[PDB]
Nucleic acid binder design. Structure first.
Lengths: 102, 225, 118, 67, 62
RNA sequence: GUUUUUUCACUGACCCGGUGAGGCGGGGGGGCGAGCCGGGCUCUCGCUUCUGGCGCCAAGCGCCCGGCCGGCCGGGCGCGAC
């Protein structure tokens, strides 16, 4: 007559994820004109450890093509990516590592 | 003579080259919920096969003939609330010591004098909000042998009457001088609505895709041919 | 005009001020935290008469809704004296006691006789 | 009177004319909130029957109920 | 170096010349990384001129 | 013709994703490869990859116009950015 532990897992409350020190969502940069028609360049600021995840994440800092603001992204870091490397991303990007083209 | 400091400083607006300039974004703005709704309402009147009882209101008395008509109708306007006193004040004068021909406003007055066959010309508006108020009236006029035309705007039809909007406007009687101009309006209107009504009943509206969905079809035609 | 931004924004309409056809309440409420309502009585206690005779202070039991500022203007206006500082505590009994230190050109013991405490 | 023509038109709901109107509106209404003020009766005719007059203090709220 | 190691709301009290060093990026960036970005800002800007001059010389025979 | 039915693709309800809803789709202009003896077509691409800099809040050029005394003193509007 008792509910099993798995049914108790769906409610959350106790079985929810421990996302206090989790360093943001590891998202690939948003599509825009400079991903679709050519490439946009960003610097690798620092490879960083995320709690619960096994892969290190890379703070990659692009420059906003419309504002004078600067845009920081959290990529899942490719093996052999390093800090002070340029990451390119778009249709006319080149086919080497850490470099996100369609 | 010119200042050799004053230099050309050209901006390269390539990809990952400079800032992009403040160029036009009107056709990318995330609009309010109502502005989106009223716009993609106007688009569903172009995709969906509009039945010809509704499409017959897109067929409008064109610019030259509309402006021709309202100069005549401007004679036969119903008088204002302020002008109302100025005859009822003259009642108090003549008692102390004939009504002219006018326009007929509203669907209910107009329809009763289409069955009575008093209406000489019925001026219908195209933009009536629930269309059902007016849908039957082009059909009713054709059967009773009443000439009908359709203006663009209940607003500009509702300025003839001293109101905001009016659906329909009918002519019953006219001054004998203006008898000829109404007789000439009826001829251009009977031959453009009443006389070609059997083809109005067949003329479905919309069924026309988006301009870039036309363009993709029209490309696949050429890629074959 | 061209849309500089890709966001639509609620355009800043003109909003007017209250010009009411009648005031809701007929009269402005009379102040009930007066100069007399605030100061109830002085403490004539062993601890409080030494406080007068030594520190050049007066000790009053005061209305619990009072600031130090309201007590200073009250002690001034009722006793034609000037106050250096007011300390306040709310007693366990529930009433607010004020320790009204007086400016050095006034004796507390010569004004305590004038109010009539001994 | 126009109202009898509006009455008998609303009784032909399977007709091409009213099927189009009942679909383009039933579209329109979904994109609004479940409880909003209509500026007038969508059916002026039906509202006449049910006692709505066109004078100040008569209000008309289009409210959708989940089915 | 040259900036006081004090709790951050104390920096209101401190005079301007306590909180920085008298240089470009002074008391925000270290001298090592400023002189390595005067060179970078120059030598990148020099290599752009070589690429600009090789560009218009690759045009002239076609 | 009427209607059932399977297979293709259509968008317009309906759904999903993204975004600060930031360049979508057509057409025009300009670049090189390909082609007949200054002409045009069948097409193409669209500025940034040697470096752990800098990058916004217009330069320039058109176009108008407000005192003093044609020649000395400031704004607006286009194009740049079809």
């Amino acid at each position: 007559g008792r509910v099993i532990r798995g049914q108790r897992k769906g409610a959350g409350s106790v079985f929810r994820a421990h996302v206090k020190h989790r360093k943001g969502a590891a998202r690939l940069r948003a599509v825009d004109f400079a991903e679709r028609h050519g490439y946009i360049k960003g610097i690798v600021k620092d490879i960083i450890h995320d709690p619960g995840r096994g892969a290190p994440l890379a703070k990659v800092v692009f420059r906003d093509p419309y504002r004078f603001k600067k845009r920081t992204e959290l990529f899942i870091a490719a093996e052999g990516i390093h800090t002070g490397q340029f990451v390119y991303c778009g249709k006319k990007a080149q086919l080497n590592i850490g470099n996100v083209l369609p | 003579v010119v200042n050799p400091l004053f230099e050309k400083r050209p901006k390269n607006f390539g990809i990952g080259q400079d800032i992009q300039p403040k160029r036009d974004l009107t056709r990318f703005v995330k609009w309010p919920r109502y502005i989106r709704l009223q716009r993609q309402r106007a688009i569903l009147y172009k995709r969906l096969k509009v039945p010809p009882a509704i499409n017959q209101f897109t067929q409008v008395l064109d610019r030259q003939t509309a402006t021709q008509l309202l100069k005549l109708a401007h004679k036969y306007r119903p008088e204002t609330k302020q002008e109302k006193k100025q005859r009822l004040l003259a009642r108090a004068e003549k008692k102390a010591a004939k009504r002219p021909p006018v326009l007929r406003a509203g669907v209910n007055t107009v329809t009763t004098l289409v069955e009575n066959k008093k209406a000489q010309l019925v001026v219908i508006a195209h933009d009536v909000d629930p269309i059902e108020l007016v849908v039957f009236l082009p059909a009713l006029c054709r059967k009773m042998g009443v000439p009908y035309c359709i203006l663009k705007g209940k607003a500009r039809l509702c300025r003839l009457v001293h109101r905001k909007t009016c659906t329909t406007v009918a002519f019953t009687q006219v001054n004998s001088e203006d008898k000829g101009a109404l007789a000439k309006l009826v001829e251009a209107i009977r031959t453009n609505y009443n006389d070609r009504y059997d083809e109005i009943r067949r003329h479905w509206g919309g069924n026309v895709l988006g301009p870039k969905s036309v363009a993709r079809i029209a490309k696949l035609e050429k890629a074959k041919a | 005009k061209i849309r500089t931004s890709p966001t639509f924004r609620r355009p800043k309409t003109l909003r007017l001020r209250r010009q009411p056809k009648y005031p809701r309440k007929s009269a402005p409420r009379r102040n009930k935290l007066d100069h007399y309502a605030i100061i109830k009585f002085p403490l004539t206690t062993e601890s409080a008469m030494k406080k007068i005779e030594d520190n050049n202070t007066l000790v009053f039991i005061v209305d619990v809704k009072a600031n130090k500022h309201q007590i200073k203007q009250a002690v001034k206006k009722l006793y034609d004296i000037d106050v250096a500082k007011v300390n306040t505590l709310i007693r366990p009994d529930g009433e607010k006691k004020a320790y009204v230190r007086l400016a050095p050109d006034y004796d507390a013991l010569d004004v305590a006789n004038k109010i009539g405490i001994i | 009177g126009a109202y009898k023509y509006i009455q008998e038109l609303w009784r032909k709901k399977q007709s091409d004319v009213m099927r189009f109107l009942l679909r383009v509106r039933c579209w329109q209404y979904r994109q609004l909130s479940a409880l909003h003020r209509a500026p007038r009766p969508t059916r002026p005719d039906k509202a006449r029957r049910l006692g709505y007059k066109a004078k100040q203090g008569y209000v008309i709220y289009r409210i959708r109920v989940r089915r | 170096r040259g900036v006081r190691a004090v709790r951050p709301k104390v920096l209101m009290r401190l005079s301007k010349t306590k909180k920085h060093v008298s240089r470009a990026y002074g008391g925000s960036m270290c001298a090592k990384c400023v002189r390595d970005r005067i060179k970078r800002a120059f030598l990148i800007e020099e290599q752009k001129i070589v690429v600009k001059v090789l560009k218009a010389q690759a045009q002239s025979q076609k």
